[PDB]
Amino acid sequence: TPAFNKPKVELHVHLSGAIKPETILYFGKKRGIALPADTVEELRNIIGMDKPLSQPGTLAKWDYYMPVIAGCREAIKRIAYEFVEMKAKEGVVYVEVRYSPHLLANSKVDPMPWNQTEGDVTPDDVVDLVNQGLHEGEQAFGIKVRSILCCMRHQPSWSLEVLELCKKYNQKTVVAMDLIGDETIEGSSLFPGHVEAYEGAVKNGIHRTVHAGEFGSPEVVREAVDILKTERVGHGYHTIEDEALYNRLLKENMHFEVCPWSSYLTGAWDPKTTHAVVRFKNDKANYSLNTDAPLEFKSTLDTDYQMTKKDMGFTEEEFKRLNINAAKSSFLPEEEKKELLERLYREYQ
């Protein structure tokens, strides 16, 4: 029985963490690329996670299946299309989906990811093919989807390029820029490539989210807000370790993109402690609930709502309040945001 059988808004989910295992198998076979299993079940057992690992152990799953997907025009469009299909099944009326265009390319990307042979699919092609699948998906399945392009903490040399892509494909599907990767890298938030990309974002009306405070380091959250000028924080559980910063961000109405089930499996949240989202709820903070990587976490949006309802005593009206906040904090042009908001109001009546 679904925890929240009403319209939801999702703001934090990775496209490459939300591929169908049967679709991976299909393209592995078609392209003659090796995979450690030949069935959905076995592939799920390998890439899926039943128990907490860690940041690196989570990220390690991508190497199994990304060679099958990256560099194939047909595959890139299809996962985007199928992303919409499966999200539509989760009672989501509006999704923002994020990815690194560089990680799906096999051309004009230095260094080359996934041990790929140099081909002809550029980062620009990737964004184009994803736009195509998300746009076709939106028409076919009746829900609204927009994209977010990701900078990588360890590759600031790609960030200005991520900004250029955001600018070229503004509103045709891209609404924002993200920053992913290892937040424990000393001063990665300050690398000139990220700093200037995020400065250029402000200048160009490209919206801004940043992964920070997922595993620790409240200072990285402060860096995201004060230096990169982010509008939402991805995760941000460890912001509560600096009470003065958490207090300020509460007053400034900062949005926290919360991924409860993810935080457990990545080991970001120690299960013996109470989840940060409990403080967010009690403080009436601005936050959303999100799947993050449903493939690795074997989850749907209901996983994360079930979790909060059962273990953390979340109510119908808290689920309603946070989805309204997620809408208000969405990266839509004002008029589309009003529409989304008005739809939520009537269905929560």
118 binds Zn ion per the rule CB under 5 A: no
Which residue of 10, 138, 214, 292 would you call a contact of Ca ion, by CB under 5 A? 214
173 and 135 in contact (C-beta within 8 Å)? yes
Binding footprint of Zn ion, residue count (CB under 5 A): 4
- Least Å distance, CB 244 to Zn ion, is 26
Q: Which two tokens stand for residue 146?
A: 């927009």
63 binds Zn ion per the rule CB under 5 A: no
Report DSSP letters for 319-330, one per residue: HHHHHHHHHHTS
- Least Å distance, CB 316 to Zn ion, is 27
231 and 208 in contact (C-beta within 8 Å)? yes
216 binds Ca ion per the rule CB under 5 A: yes
Interface pattern 277-306 for Zn ion (x via CB under 5 A): ---------------x--------------
Conformation bin of residue 32: beta by default, left when phi > 0, alpha when psi is -120 to 50: left
41 binds Zn ion per the rule CB under 5 A: no
User: Which residue, 165 or 344, is less far from Zn ion as judged by CB?
Assistant: 165
Question: How does DSSP classify residue 157?
Answer: G
122 and 105 in contact (C-beta within 8 Å)? yes
Stretch that binds Zn ion, among 3-11, 120-128, 133-141, 274-282 (CB under 5 A): 120-128
Stretch that binds Ca ion, among 11-19, 144-152, 217-225, 339-347 (CB under 5 A): 217-225
**Residues within window 153-212 making contact with Ca ion, judged by CB under 5 A:** 183
Burial class (CB in 10 A: 0-12, 13-18, 19+), 74: exposed
User: Which residue, 169 or 237, is less far from Ca ion as judged by CB?
Assistant: 237
- Residues carrying an active site annotation: 214
**Spatial separation of the C-alpha atoms in residues 176 and 242, rounded to whole Å:** 27
215 binds Ca ion per the rule CB under 5 A: yes
Sheet strands side by side (includes 174-180): 8-10, 92-99, 144-152, 174-180, 207-212, 232-235, 255-258, 286-289
Q: Counting runs of H as helices and runs of E as strands, what totals does the chain give?
A: 16, 8
**Spatial separation of the C-alpha atoms in residues 143 and 331, rounded to whole Å:** 16
Stretch that binds Ca ion, among 160-168, 213-221, 320-328, 340-348 (CB under 5 A): 213-221
User: Which residue, 95 or 344, is less far from Zn ion as judged by CB?
Assistant: 95
- Least Å distance, CB 150 to Zn ion, is 9
- Least Å distance, CB 85 to Zn ion, is 21
- Least Å distance, CB 101 to Zn ion, is 13
Stretch that binds Zn ion, among 26-34, 121-129, 135-143, 328-336 (CB under 5 A): 121-129
Out of Ca ion, Zn ion, none, which partner does residue 296 contact, by CB within 5 to 8 A per kind?
none
Residues 6+ apart with CB under 8 A from 247: none
120 binds Zn ion per the rule CB under 5 A: yes
| Residue 150 DSSP SS3 | strand
223 binds Ca ion per the rule CB under 5 A: no
Out of Zn ion, Ca ion, none, which partner does residue 38 contact, by CB within 5 to 8 A per kind?
Zn ion
- Least Å distance, CB 335 to Ca ion, is 36
85 binds Zn ion per the rule CB under 5 A: no
257 binds Ca ion per the rule CB under 5 A: no
**Spatial separation of the C-alpha atoms in residues 177 and 228, rounded to whole Å:** 11
Report DSSP letters for 109-149, one per residue: -SSPSTTPPP-S--HHHHHHHHHHHHHHHHHHH--EEEEEE
Which residue of 5, 22, 38, 253 would you call a contact of Zn ion, by CB under 5 A? 38
The partner residues of 235 in beta bridges, in order of sequence, read: 212
Q: Which residues of this protein are in contact with Zn ion, per CB under 5 A?
A: 38, 120, 125, 292
Q: Which residues of this protein are in contact with Ca ion, per CB under 5 A?
A: 183, 214-217
